[PDB]
Design a protein around this ligand. Structure first.
Ligand SMILES: CCCc1c(OC2CCCCC2)c2cc(Cl)ccc2[nH]c1=O
Ligand SMILES: [Mg+2]
Lengths: 516, 399
């Protein structure tokens, strides 16, 4: 049988001592029949008055024991720490058959010293008589450790047969067990029954081939084939009336697709949510939201599929700017034939620029790839070395991009302006603070309503930019705005800043300096 | 085995493991499988909820991979154990060794073992993950040096009295050997300690090359000495000064600020009045040296900030209290990250040598990046505490 895993209650805690709710005699009757079988099978064993512990049971006729209390008093286990695979990470198989493990918890011994805490009681039907007490010998369904402990076992139980059959891969998941190979249909179906045997050996019953499950595998929002994959077919509604809620879901449903359906855009839809006062509120669709819905609808009407990983081949990641703020990418191995795709809206910080933002996209993809394929892909970016490098070098923060190739695919990212590294001669000089004074005598004093100390600082600079000529030196005491602009942003959530940015793009030379 | 406990009330670490690259995972499987055969570690079960992160770093001048276990959290939860040589930092040459292997002989308290739990992740979550715990003293753990202290002194008693002209300082998995002998005699004397260590149970860290602490420099603040001075020049000059004044309050700006009266054009050149000329020269003198009255509080955390000056140039400062720098330096080249790691490691080694402690860094980088590449260039056997930050413009320009 299986090596027992030792269990303990959380430090300084005793076993559950909870009272059994009354039970309809008809329910008492069904439990006894059930429990007696479990005892006939070894799963539980009547016990004596020795044991003060008790856990409530009730009928649903099936059996259910409430282990919440025991669970709260049970130690933490290295949990199943679910982190599922992503189809793009799998490798193509010829055949993949799954087996449903017949009552696995009931098939795994339970640490002797613990069994006593798993005690429960079946009330006797008549008043003067006491009811039968029990405890578990195996993994109690619904108990805290059962999963961790069950999987753990399974894994040790699968080690042998696994190294004995290299030409086979098994992925464990709850009760499911998936077996794959590039073995001959029969030769594959063979090993499978070879396995089932080995499982039976430790008493684990699996479904019959007449009753097993074969591809496609509709699992966790996915549709899996032996050679390909995708997302469960998604269908967009056709309403006249859209609720904040329907909208919110649609957007969600659209994002989901993004990992494989390139071109999905949710901007116009997401915009619908602004101001909304209730989940049931009907928002009429704007003209551009219609267009978007209509567009995605068409993108979704084409059954695109994903490909599997060929450890053999390289990973190529390609990125594009789907519009200010939006980035699209696709990881492929074979020329323009993906395994996965995706977007990136992630604006880090109020102000930013395409170079920075793109670089951040590289880091996500990078992070993402190590997680799925265990390696970073070679990147193909719409920015050139010189451009990157120029930003790179002059930025206070450290950053590094893997190996990458420039791909001339508009729009190419660039810098619409750069601050003069040195004051400009022949250019007027402005001193800002809300207003400005210049070496040439000019000045403007404006009154701002609702502004904030800092927003005032920018207005000044803006003002100066406006009034100045093609070339300008600007002197400010605001250390903040400085930072902002020195950063060289080309987009901001703050309108003000965008204006400034526009001014900046227009000038021939701007020199910004800071003074106390 | 010695009964070791976590500080009172404290439970064991449950630190997430950062995604590792297939290559590193492989290195780790190879390594760990052998540490198992040799019973240094043992596979654990689900009854162990604890976890510490592992990594595969690279050995300098060796194709071999080194497993690096980030016991940082553990060490913090480990009970304290109940002397740093001020002379070490004075030696001309310091060589560092990896006596990490020494620990692999001493068993770890069977009851503490659970807390050394670590995991080899799997790619794409396709497998559970290989879980293990230590049977012996683990490298990188704070306990090991201590518990081995004993057998460690015994092992060095002979060389120490035979070569009392040599300073030998241990820190975690490293051994610092400093002297003043000729460089040639050093490497020769070093090599001798080696076989004297083999005689009981060690590679050259940092290339088998030497640190030369004595030549360590304290980069003071500097002012632009220049021909003609423009309005801008001065404005910056006054700015930089105005700042530094909080440290060296003997700095006067008056006379310089006078040249800057009136919205003149930035580029306009301003000649310096004798009064200001001398004011600067004084400010210049004041900066020539670190501000007096800055002492190291052994009871305080040692902090370290790094700044990127571009072109492969960085600036760092080690202080415990703001503006009260215990040390400052620069570092020149590679890519931003490689450099940045090399730096931290340089700054740490020194920190150790000097104060016998590792400083807590503030890094000018986005975390996801640091997490991604750092292991690719790291070579130390320890890992300092670090946090990630955003470097202010002025304060970078001031260094
Ligand atoms: C069992 C090995 C993991 C694996 C597959 O199993 C799947 C794991 C995720 C649950 C569903 C089955 C898999 C399934 C199909 Cl349908 C095609 C290729 C595959 N390639 C693989 O590497
Ligand atoms: Mg002013």
């Amino acid at each position: 049988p299986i090596e027992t895993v030792p269990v303990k209650l959380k430090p300084g805690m005793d076993g559950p001592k909870v009272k059994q709710w009354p039970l309809t005699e008809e329910k008492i009757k069904a439990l006894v029949e059930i429990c007696t079988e479990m005892e006939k099978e070894g799963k539980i064993s009547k016990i004596g008055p020795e044991n003060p512990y008790n856990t409530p049971v009730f009928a649903i006729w099936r059996k259910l024991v409430d282990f919440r209390e025991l669970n709260k008093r049970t130690q933490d286990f290295w949990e199943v720490q679910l982190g599922i695979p992503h189809p793009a990470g799998l490798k193509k198989k010829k055949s993949v058959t799954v087996l449903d493990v017949g009552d696995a918890y009931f098939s795994v011994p339970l640490d002797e010293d613990f069994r006593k805490y798993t005690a429960f009681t079946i009330p006797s039907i008549n008043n003067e008589t006491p009811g039968i007490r029990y405890q578990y010998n195996v993994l109690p369904q619904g108990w805290k450790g059962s999963p961790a402990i069950f999987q753990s076992s399974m894994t040790k139980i699968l080690e042998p047969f696994r190294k004995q059959n290299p030409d086979i891969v098994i992925y464990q998941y709850m009760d499911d067990l998936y077996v794959g190979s590039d073995l001959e249909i029969g030769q594959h179906r063979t090993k499978i029954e070879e396995l089932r045997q080995h499982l039976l050996r430790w008493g684990l019953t699996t479904p019959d081939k007449k009753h097993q499950k074969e591809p496609p595998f509709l699992w966790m929002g996915y549709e899996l084939h032996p050679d390909k994959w995708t997302v469960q077919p998604i269908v967009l509604p056709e309403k006249d009336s859209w609720t904040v809620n329907d909208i919110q879901k649609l957007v969600g449903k659209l994002n989901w697709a993004s990992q494989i359906y390139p071109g999905i855009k949710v901007r116009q839809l997401c915009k619908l949510l602004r101001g909304t006062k209730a989940l049931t509120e009907v928002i009429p669709l704007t003209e551009e939201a219609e267009l978007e819905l209509a567009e995605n609808r068409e993108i979704l009407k084409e059954p695109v599929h994903g490909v599997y990983y060929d450890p053999s081949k390289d990973l190529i990641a390609e990125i594009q700017k789907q519009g200010q703020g939006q980035w699209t990418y696709q990881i492929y191995q074979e020329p323009f034939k993906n395994l996965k795709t995706g977007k990136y809206a992630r604006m880090r910080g109020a102000h930013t620029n395409d170079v920075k933002q793109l670089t951040e996209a590289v880091q996500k993809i990078t992070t993402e790839s190590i997680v799925i394929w265990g390696k970073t892909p070679k990147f193909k970016l719409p920015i050139q070395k010189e451009t990157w490098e120029t930003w790179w070098t002059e930025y206070w923060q450290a950053t590094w991009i893997p190996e990458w190739e420039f791909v001339n695919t508009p729009p190419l990212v660039k810098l619409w302006y750069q601050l003069e590294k040195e004051p400009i001669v022949g250019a007027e000089t402005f001193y800002v603070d809300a207003g400005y004074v210049t070496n040439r005598g000019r000045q403007k004093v404006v009154t701002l309503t609702d502004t904030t100390n800092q927003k005032t600082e920018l207005q000044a600079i803006y003002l100066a930019l406006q009034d100045s000529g093609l070339e300008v030196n600007i002197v400010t005491d605001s250390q903040y705005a400085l930072g902002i602009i020195q950063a060289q942003p080309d987009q901001s959530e703050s309108e003000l800043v965008n204006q400034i940015i526009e001014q900046l793009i227009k000038k021939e030379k701007v020199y910004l300096a800071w003074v106390p | 085995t010695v009964p070791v406990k976590l500080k009172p009330g404290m439970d064991g670490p449950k630190v997430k493991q950062w995604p590792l690259t297939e290559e590193k995972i492989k290195a780790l499987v190879e390594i760990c499988t052998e540490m198992e055969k040799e019973g240094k570690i043992s596979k654990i079960g689900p009854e162990n909820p604890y976890n510490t992160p592992v990594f595969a770093i690279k050995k300098k001048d060796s194709t071999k991979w080194r497993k690096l276990v980030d016991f940082r959290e553990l060490n913090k939860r480990t009970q304290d154990f109940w002397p740093h040589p001020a002379g070490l930092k004075k030696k001309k040459s310091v060589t560092v060794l990896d006596v990490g292997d020494a620990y692999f002989s001493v068993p770890l308290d069977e009851d503490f073992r659970k807390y050394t739990a670590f995991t080899i992740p799997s790619i794409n979550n396709e497998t559970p993950g290989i879980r293990y715990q230590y049977n012996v003293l683990p490298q990188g753990w704070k306990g090991s040096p201590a518990i081995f202290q004993s057998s460690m002194t015994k092992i060095l008693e002979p060389f120490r009295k035979q070569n009392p002209d040599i300073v030998i300082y241990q820190y975690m998995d490293d051994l610092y050997v400093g002297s003043d002998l000729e460089i040639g005699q050093h490497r020769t004397k070093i090599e001798e300690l080696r076989q004297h260590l083999l005689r009981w149970g060690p590679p050259f860290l940092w290339m088998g090359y030497e640190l030369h602490p004595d030549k360590w420099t304290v980069q003071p603040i500097v002012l632009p000495e220049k021909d003609s001075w423009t309005v801008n020049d001065i404005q910056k000059l006054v700015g930089k000064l105005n700042w530094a004044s909080q440290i060296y309050p003997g700095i006067k700006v008056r006379q310089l600020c006078k040249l800057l009266r009136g919205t003149k054009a930035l580029t306009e050149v301003i000649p310096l009045t004798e009064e200001a000329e001398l004011e600067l020269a004084e400010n210049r003198e004041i900066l020539k040296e670190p501000v007096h009255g800055v002492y190291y509080d052994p009871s305080k955390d040692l902090i370290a900030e790094i700044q990127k000056q571009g072109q492969g140039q960085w600036t760092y400062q080690i202080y415990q209290e703001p503006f009260k720098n215990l040390k400052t330096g620069k570092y020149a080249r590679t890519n931003d990250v490689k450099q940045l790691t090399e730096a931290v490691q340089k700054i740490t080694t020194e920190s150790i040598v000097i104060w016998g402690k590792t400083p807590k860094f503030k890094l000018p980088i986005q975390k996801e990046t640091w997490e991604t590449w750092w292991t690719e260039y790291w070579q130390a056997t320890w890992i300092p505490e670090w946090e990630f930050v955003n470097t202010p413009p002025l304060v970078k320009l001031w260094y």
